[PDB]
């Protein structure tokens, strides 16, 4: 209805803070917890999507998402922010190369993972509606 354009606008308006969160979490976890997602329901919040979970989703949608598995495997986290947007029975790829790159975003924003999670979830609350 409106969540795709609302999510897209939120990402474009917050690339630097999203990149900082992406890199902070990379420093903490690598890919050990899976891929970062934004779950829009019941309120927008960050999740980790284990590889096994993404495979099950792709199988249940008859491989319509096969390219997503490859995008995840090949992501270069020093350059590319990667996130899975989770709407109502629909997912949206978030992949962008910010300026400056994610490690510099994390250093320049100067906020820890907690503060990034909090500020970004507050910013999404009420602006992305499913």
């Amino acid at each position: 209805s409106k969540w795709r354009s609302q999510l897209d606008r939120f990402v474009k308006e917050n690339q630097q803070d999203l990149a900082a969160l992406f890199w902070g979490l990379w420093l903490e976890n690598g890919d050990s917890q899976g891929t970062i997602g934004i779950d829009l329901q019941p309120t927008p919040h960050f999740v980790y999507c284990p590889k096994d979970a993404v495979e099950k989703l792709n199988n249940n949608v008859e491989n319509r998402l096969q390219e997503l598995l490859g995008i995840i495997e090949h992501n270069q986290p020093e350059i590319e922010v990667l996130m899975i947007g989770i709407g109502k029975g629909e997912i949206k790829l978030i992949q962008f190369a910010p300026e400056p790159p994610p490690p510099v975003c994390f250093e320049q924003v100067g906020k820890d993972i907690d503060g990034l999670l909090e500020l970004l979830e507050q910013r999404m609350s009420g602006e992305i509606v499913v």
Partner: peptide, 15 residues
Amino acid sequence: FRENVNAIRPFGRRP
């Protein structure tokens, strides 16, 4: 799918 993902929570300001 949503049942298989894990919330990323702040540690929080612990008292």
